[PDB]
Swiss-Prot record, chain A:
The keyword Mitochondrion applies. Component of the mitochondrial small ribosomal subunit (mt-SSU). Mature yeast 74S mitochondrial ribosomes consist of a small (37S) and a large (54S) subunit. The 37S small subunit contains a 15S ribosomal RNA (15S mt-rRNA) and 34 different proteins. The 54S large subunit contains a 21S rRNA (21S mt-rRNA) and 46 different proteins. It comes from the Eukaryota. This is Small ribosomal subunit protein bS18m. It is found in: Mitochondrion. Belongs to the bacterial ribosomal protein bS18 family. It comes from Saccharomyces cerevisiae (strain ATCC 204508 / S288c). Present with 1210 molecules/cell in log phase SD medium. Keywords: Mitochondrion, Ribonucleoprotein, Ribosomal protein, Transit peptide. GO terms for molecular function: small ribosomal subunit rRNA binding; structural constituent of ribosome. The lineage of its organism: Eukaryota, Fungi, Dikarya, Ascomycota, Saccharomycotina. The chain holds residues 38 to 138 of 138 of the full protein.
Swiss-Prot record, chain B:
Keywords: Mitochondrion, Ribonucleoprotein, Ribosomal protein, Transit peptide. Present with 2840 molecules/cell in log phase SD medium. Its main location: mitochondrion. SUPFAM superfamilies: Fe,Mn superoxide dismutase (SOD), C-terminal domain (SSF54719). PANTHER family: 37S RIBOSOMAL PROTEIN S26, MITOCHONDRIAL (PTHR43595), SMALL RIBOSOMAL SUBUNIT PROTEIN MS43 (PTHR43595:SF1). The lineage of its organism: Eukaryota, Fungi, Dikarya, Ascomycota, Saccharomycotina. This is Small ribosomal subunit protein mS43.
Curated annotation (Swiss-Prot), chain C:
It is found in: Mitochondrion. InterPro entries: Mn/Fe_SOD_C, Mn/Fe_SOD_N_sf, SOD_C_sf. Belongs to the mitochondrion-specific ribosomal protein mS42 family. Pfam families: Sod_Fe_C. Keywords: Mitochondrion, Ribonucleoprotein, Ribosomal protein. The keyword Translocase does not apply. This is Small ribosomal subunit protein mS42. One of its GO terms (biological process) is mitochondrial translation. Component of the mitochondrial small ribosomal subunit (mt-SSU). Mature yeast 74S mitochondrial ribosomes consist of a small (37S) and a large (54S) subunit. The 37S small subunit contains a 15S ribosomal RNA (15S mt-rRNA) and 34 different proteins. The 54S large subunit contains a 21S rRNA (21S mt-rRNA) and 46 different proteins. mS42 forms a heterodimer with mS43, building a large protuberance adjacent to the mRNA channel exit in the mt-SSU body. The lineage of its organism: Eukaryota, Fungi, Dikarya, Ascomycota, Saccharomycotina. Present with 2060 molecules/cell in log phase SD medium. Coiled coil: none annotated. GO terms for cellular component: cytoplasm; mitochondrial inner membrane; mitochondrial small ribosomal subunit; mitochondrion. One of its GO terms (molecular function) is superoxide dismutase activity.
Curated annotation (Swiss-Prot), chain D:
This is Small ribosomal subunit protein mS23. It is found in: Mitochondrion. It comes from the Eukaryota. Belongs to the mitochondrion-specific ribosomal protein mS23 family. Component of the mitochondrial ribosome (mitoribosome), a dedicated translation machinery responsible for the synthesis of mitochondrial genome-encoded proteins, including at least some of the essential transmembrane subunits of the mitochondrial respiratory chain. The mitoribosomes are attached to the mitochondrial inner membrane and translation products are cotranslationally integrated into the membrane. Disulfide bonds: none annotated. It comes from Saccharomyces cerevisiae (strain ATCC 204508 / S288c). The lineage of its organism: Eukaryota, Fungi, Dikarya, Ascomycota, Saccharomycotina. Component of the mitochondrial small ribosomal subunit (mt-SSU). Mature yeast 74S mitochondrial ribosomes consist of a small (37S) and a large (54S) subunit. The 37S small subunit contains a 15S ribosomal RNA (15S mt-rRNA) and 34 different proteins. The 54S large subunit contains a 21S rRNA (21S mt-rRNA) and 46 different proteins. Present with 1920 molecules/cell in log phase SD medium.
Length: 101, 303, 257, 106, 300, 92
């Protein structure tokens, strides 16, 4: 067979430097273990400094912090500060009461 | 031998600012006399053909190497002293001799410049140098550093690649064939030549003789080739060729424009063991850029 | 920091040079100036690195196989070679500064003259010296070194190096000048050497060479120009080989006691 | 700042083991010193000497002046190594494994 | 004093670094200073750090973050492999060139205001170059600056009525120009980001000046041949070039006309084979990466 | 910022059932393939000849082959050895 699963091969980006270890299975496993959604902050409005309570009339943004059924995600998952989690939950509950979410 | 004489090099007179009287004797007069004698003791045609002819005629032959080693050593030495005129800097024999502390001085070749070609009217040479080396501070640094790196005998050349890698009717039109694509710096060691058309491929040619001779002895032995001698010799030959090819074809030649001598013979008498960089600094301030601009071919404006 | 070794009877060396070979000015250039020049450059190249704690001979062996450390190798080889040359041409290795000894008559030992006959097909020492002078003039166009070396087979032979070529490690002997033309026989030697270096299994691609120098002659311009002049290097090599210190050269031949 | 501007200077190995701090006799009028490598610290000590001697007033100007001295020394060394390798191969030096070859094998 | 000595100690020379020792993102340049120990010191677990490195470590190169921690261990990784990437780049003898034809950053050039005609582009970059700034510290750039700029009102309320009164009575198209110049002229004396942390040129990867030719026993080298590896068996999606692994760098390989048939045959194991490449050019991007372009030299 | 959770002083640091990677038996995977091969191409179909030959060799002497991959985890040995050093407990 001339085919390998993507999970068993690492694609080295262009312009990056590499070591011989980057072709091993250890690199594959190490990349899985340390795979965190750290790029969310730059794409996370609520981790930028905006007040989540100003989005109570924008269900599309709020729908990014609820599950498929509408359950607000725990702070352990959202990664927000205590204040933003508190404000975000209020925004979602207010949005639900207005009839938008 | 007036055949190897320059009008600015007069016995008994010093090249002011670079060589003293005792330093110009040893460097040039006492040195050409030896090389001439050795060239006259190897070939009887020394006083018959031009030096550059001997260099390109007896080349690639191991039996005539001594004719070409002395012939190309006297050519390089003349071509180096030809572009030197002198400087207003204090005479080398009146300055204190640099000691060990010189090795700790920081070179200032990236902050200041001096004796640029354009300042003397050679405007076409300055534009070419800026185009190929980026600037005249980059050129000066890459030229003084390349020569300073040479440990023993050698020359640092300012060359101009010839854009006639076609090989068809080559060397038939003294203008259509004298066209330079880009300028470069090249280092030669001992009796090495900066042309590269009469020497390129020597190792590949000798490599192919060795493999054929070994292959014919193997046939006498009666062997079934090898698993990776045909794939290793092939790779060695494929790399030897791909590394000597030109942009279009494989005829890459170079036109000597300038040459700085790195041999200790030139600078040891006047500057001492620690004064090679001082020698190279005074050499830069003693280059007549007119002679260099004259040698410069006409740009190949295919662009 | 690599410092220039102190030489025996240094006050005499700075006043009357080396009798019959170099003058006071000539010896200041070759040793007091050039050796300082080399050691300072070696310190600048190796300071802050592991190589600073190793003697020059060990540095050249460690760096012999590393292409991009050739600059360090050249400096280490030159420093070791220069003190090998300055050591066997020195009036007396012992420091007779307070003994004011002026009678040092050193002559080839019996073991040295026996190995010369064995390895040179019965040729005498005088004839071998003529071959050494000839080899230097025809094989070293520019700078280099002339060595009389002994190999693992107890055979003395003559090796010439271009610029800073070590006698200990054949891949870096630099005995062939590839700037000029080479015969098919020389290309075969180079091709055979390359094959030997490729048979080594070590990840550093290094081979075993047990060659050791016995006599060293500096063929650099720093040693002869000032006293002999351009073109007179054969008169310099003749004087060096005729005024060698044989207490040092004899001690370099392994006896086995 | 220096290692933020020159990230690849980090790739040059540094030895933290001291020899004898008391023996350091350095004259920082020049950047090169006998006994120590040329590295980022050479630039910093040169910058301090300039500000200490009051040749320059602003730290930025002294730092920039030292940086150029550092580039010149770095360029002379990059050429000495390239040329030394080229000159050796031209005299018949042979090398078993190059750095590129070492990486391929690993 | 002891404080003076400490500031100059070899440990002080290493700049503070807390970047993750285990980073799984894109690596473009070295992030940690390599520490080297001699063989003699390695035999005694001496690295010049606070504590002995465990004897299990056989490498002579490491990278560390903290000398000591609350876990009573040193935070280090026994690797020094970014040095071999730099030395392999040096062996390829390809000088780094500017694709924009900018001045060489390693030379003290006499520059002029040719690019200074964008005073309003960069004077406001100080407040507009705030991509990753706090929502309130960036807001402190609005009141803190306003007071500073508002302190020059009297100076600009007299200079403008003494040097360009016509514009004040005709149009503000030129007044805005005099404002941008005024602040810059009154800010060049100031020190706002007087130290620039941007990478300077190659960042130290190469100090080689373009122009020099490589002499070889077989003549001057015209094309640099370097062994490499093809990573993917299908060109980069959306790009007309494949990717190769040459000397610790990932390059974009351009093929003459066709792709060798070993590609289809090998498939996803193409990286298992070594090909010969030619390095066309090498460029440096602002992120600090090296843009190496290669060409798959195929036996012909 | 990622919340670090620090444990109180503990009588032990131990994994109740350390996980181990148990490589699959080569003979059982061969049997699972042969059984599938017969499900598609049919029982005794000539397409499964190689599978049958391989299975016979795998199980010829031992029906599960030479099982020589037994392993035990060392996490509990290291965890108990290093806990006192790395727990960050204040001095006595």
């Amino acid at each position: 067979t001339k085919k390998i699963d993507q999970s068993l091969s690492k694609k080295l980006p262009k312009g990056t430097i590499y070591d011989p270890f980057d072709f091993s299975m250890g690199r594959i496993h190490l990349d899985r273990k340390y795979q965190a959604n750290k790029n969310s902050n730059r794409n996370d409005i609520m981790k930028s400094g905006a007040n989540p309570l100003e989005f109570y009339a924008r269900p599309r943004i709020l729908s990014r912090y609820v599950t498929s059924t509408g359950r607000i995600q725990h702070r352990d998952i959202t990664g927000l500060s205590a204040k933003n989690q508190r404000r975000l939950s209020k925004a979602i509950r207010r949005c639900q009461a207005i009839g938008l979410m | 031998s007036t055949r190897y004489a320059l009008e600015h090099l007069k016995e008994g007179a010093p090249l002011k600012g670079l060589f003293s009287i005792e330093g110009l004797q040893k460097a040039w007069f006492d040195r050409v006399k030896y090389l001439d004698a050795k060239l006259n003791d190897c070939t009887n045609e020394a006083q018959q053909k031009p030096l550059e002819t001997l260099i390109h005629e007896n080349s690639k032959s191991a039996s005539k190497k001594h004719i070409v080693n002395y012939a190309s050593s006297l050519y390089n030495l003349k071509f180096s002293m030809s572009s030197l005129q002198g400087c207003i800097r204090t005479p080398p024999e009146e300055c204190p001799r640099l000691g060990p502390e010189a090795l700790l001085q920081t070179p200032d070749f990236n902050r200041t410049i001096s004796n640029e070609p354009l300042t003397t009217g050679n405007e076409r040479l300055q534009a070419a140098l800026i185009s190929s080396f980026g600037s005249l501070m980059e050129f000066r640094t890459l030229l003084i550093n390349s020569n300073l790196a040479i440990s023993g005998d050698g020359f640092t050349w300012l060359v101009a690649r010839r854009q006639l890698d076609k090989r068809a009717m080559r060397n038939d039109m003294p203008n259509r064939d004298i066209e330079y694509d880009k300028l470069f710096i090249l280092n030669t060691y001992n009796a090495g030549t900066p042309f590269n058309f009469s020497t390129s491929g020597v190792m590949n040619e000798l490599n192919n003789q060795y493999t054929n001779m070994e292959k014919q002895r193997a046939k006498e032995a009666g062997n079934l080739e090898d698993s990776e001698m045909t794939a290793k010799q092939a790779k060695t030959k494929f790399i030897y060729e791909t590394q000597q090819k030109g942009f279009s074809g494989k005829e890459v030649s170079y036109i000597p424009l300038l040459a700085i001598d790195a041999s200790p013979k030139t600078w040891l008498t006047d500057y001492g063991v620690f004064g090679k960089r001082e020698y190279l600094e005074r050499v830069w301030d003693s280059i007549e850029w007119k002679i260099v601009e004259s040698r410069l071919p006409q740009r190949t404006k295919i662009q | 920091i690599h410092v220039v070794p102190k030489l025996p009877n240094s006050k005499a060396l700075l006043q009357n040079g080396v009798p019959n070979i170099l003058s006071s000015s000539g010896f200041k250039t070759v040793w007091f100036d050039y050796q300082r020049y080399l050691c300072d450059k070696l310190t600048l190249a190796t300071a802050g690195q592991s190589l600073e704690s190793y003697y020059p001979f060990h540095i050249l062996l460690k760096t012999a196989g590393n292409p991009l450390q050739s600059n360090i190798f050249n400096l280490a080889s030159s420093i070791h070679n220069n003190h090998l040359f300055v050591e066997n041409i020195l009036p007396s290795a012992v420091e007779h500064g307070t003994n004011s000894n002026a009678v040092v008559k050193t002559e080839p030992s019996r073991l040295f003259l026996s190995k010369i006959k064995d390895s040179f097909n019965g040729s005498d020492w005088e004839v071998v010296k003529e071959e050494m002078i000839y080899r230097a003039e025809n094989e070293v166009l520019g700078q280099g070194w002339l060595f009389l070396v002994e190999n693992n087979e107890k055979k003395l032979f003559i090796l010439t190096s271009n610029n800073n070529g070590t006698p200990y490690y054949f891949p870096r002997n630099q005995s062939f000048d590839l700037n000029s033309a080479i015969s098919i026989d020389e290309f075969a030697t180079l091709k055979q050497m390359k094959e030997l270096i490729g048979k080594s299994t070590k990840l550093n691609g290094k081979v075993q060479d047990w060659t050791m120098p016995i006599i060293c002659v500096n063929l650099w311009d720093h040693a002869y120009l000032h006293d002999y002049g351009v073109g007179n290097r054969s008169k310099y090599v003749k004087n060096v080989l005729d005024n060698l210190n044989w207490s040092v050269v004899n001690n370099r031949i392994f006896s086995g006691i | 700042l220096f290692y933020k501007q020159h990230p690849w200077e980090l790739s040059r190995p540094k030895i933290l083991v001291e020899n004898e701090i008391g023996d350091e006799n350095y004259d920082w009028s020049h950047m090169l010193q006998i006994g120590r490598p040329l590295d980022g610290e050479s630039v910093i000590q040169r910058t301090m000497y300039l500000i200490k001697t009051k040749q320059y007033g602003d730290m930025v100007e002294a730092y920039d002046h030292a940086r150029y001295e550092f580039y010149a020394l770095r360029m002379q060394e990059e050429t000495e190594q390239q040329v030394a390798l080229e000159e050796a191969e031209m005299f018949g030096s042979l090398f078993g494994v190059s750095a590129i070859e070492h990486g391929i094998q690993k | 004093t002891l404080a003076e000595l400490l500031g100059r100690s070899r440990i002080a020379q290493v700049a503070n670094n807390h970047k993750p020792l285990t980073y799984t993102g894109k690596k473009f340049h070295p992030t940690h200073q390599i520490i080297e120990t001699k063989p003699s010191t390695l035999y005694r677990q001496e690295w010049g750090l606070k504590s002995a490195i465990p004897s299990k470590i056989k490498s002579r190169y490491l990278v560390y973050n903290d000398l000591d921690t609350l876990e009573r261990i040193t935070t280090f990784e026994p690797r020094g492999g970014t040095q071999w990437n730099r030395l392999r780049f040096q062996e390829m003898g390809v000088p780094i060139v500017s694709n924009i034809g900018r001045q060489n950053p390693f030379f003290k050039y006499i520059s002029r205001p040719e690019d200074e005609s964008h005073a309003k582009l960069s004077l406001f970059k100080e407040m507009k170059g705030d991509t990753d700034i706090s929502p309130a510290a960036m807001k402190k750039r609005l009141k803190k600056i306003t007071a500073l700029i508002r302190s020059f009102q009297d100076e600009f309320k007299e200079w403008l009525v003494e040097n360009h009164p016509d514009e004040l009575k005709l149009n503000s198209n030129k007044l805005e120009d005099y404002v941008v110049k005024f602040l810059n002229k009154k800010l060049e004396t100031k020190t706002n980001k007087k130290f620039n942390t941007e990478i300077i040129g190659t960042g130290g990867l190469s100090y080689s000046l373009p122009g020099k030719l490589k002499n070889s026993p077989n003549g001057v080298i015209q094309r640099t041949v370097v062994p490499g590896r093809i990573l993917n068996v299908v060109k980069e999606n959306n790009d007309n070039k494949w990717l190769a692994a040459i000397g610790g760098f990932v390059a974009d390989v351009v093929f003459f006309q066709s792709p060798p048939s070993s590609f289809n045959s090998m498939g996803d194991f193409i990286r298992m084979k070594t090909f010969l490449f030619e390095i066309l050019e090498a460029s440096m991007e602002k992120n600090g990466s090296v843009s190496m372009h290669a060409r798959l030299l195929e036996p012909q | 910022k990622p919340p670090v959770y620090r444990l109180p002083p503990l009588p032990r640091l131990k994994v109740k059932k350390p996980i181990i990677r148990q490589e699959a038996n080569k003979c059982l995977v061969l049997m699972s393939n042969l059984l599938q091969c017969w499900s598609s191409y049919g029982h005794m179909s000539p397409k499964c000849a190689g599978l049958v030959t391989e299975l016979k060799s795998c199980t010829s002497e031992s029906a599960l082959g030479k099982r020589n991959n037994v392993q035990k985890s060392n996490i509990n040995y290291h965890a108990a050895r290093l806990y006192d050093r790395i727990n960050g407990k204040p001095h006595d």
